[PDB]
């Protein structure tokens, strides 16, 4: 595995990031974790694709164009912004809202968010 | 596993944070990870414990009280800023401090940083 990559149990549903890579291959529950690619699980563009807004002191991160739900079953664990070796999560929870602000200095970002049902977006800046 | 612990490989080194815990014990090397409990591994607290200064619009983080060194073989790995729902982390580079500053509103953090050699490490606010 690779930095930042995240992977999750599909049988028991343990999801983790990578914070240093280069090993053999994670596994649990007997069976390699899945990778989970960005944009790999295509769900919904216009409700998973986090959109950037850059604002005073920072970027607003909304999911999507459309707000995605946030329901007890379905919606968005965390958006996670990445910029120059810094990665900022905020873990969300059914009930929230689909957003997130971070305070950073950075023109350059990537956001991704991980949607329970729906897997990984991301979109740059 | 539980949310936002820290394991690591013993055998090849993958280290992973838990984003969505609650399943089976992760694995790698065919061995269950190991849980890096922060201060579990006593090293020098004047070098591991991360000290926590209030700044301008949010946190300096520095490690330690005695700066750690940052060399190709030892160096902290990231530094990682907890509070109300986020994880900020900065990765960190041989030749790099081992600081980090986090813009973040906030009056109550927790600081963990992560030594090569030495472990997981945490501090309070
Ligand atoms: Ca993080
Ligand atoms: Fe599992
Ligand atoms: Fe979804
Ligand atoms: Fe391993
Ligand atoms: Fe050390």
Do not use: Q
């Not at 990537?110 to 800046?125: D, Q, S, V």
């Amino acid at each position: 595995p690779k930095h930042l990559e995240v992977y999750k149990c599909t049988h028991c549903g343990n999801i983790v990031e990578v914070l240093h890579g280069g090993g053999a291959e994670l596994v649990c529950c007997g069976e390699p974790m899945k990778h989970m690619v960005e944009g790999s699980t295509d769900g919904a563009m216009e409700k998973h694709v986090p959109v950037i807004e850059k604002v005073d002191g920072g970027y607003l991160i909304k999911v999507g164009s459309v707000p995605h739900p946030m329901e007890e079953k379905h919606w968005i664990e965390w958006i996670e912004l990445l910029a120059d070796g810094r990665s900022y999560t905020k873990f969300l929870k059914p009930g929230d809202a689909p957003e997130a602000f971070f305070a950073i200095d950075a023109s350059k970002v990537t956001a991704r968010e991980y949607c329970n049902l729906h897997g990984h977006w991301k979109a740059e800046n």
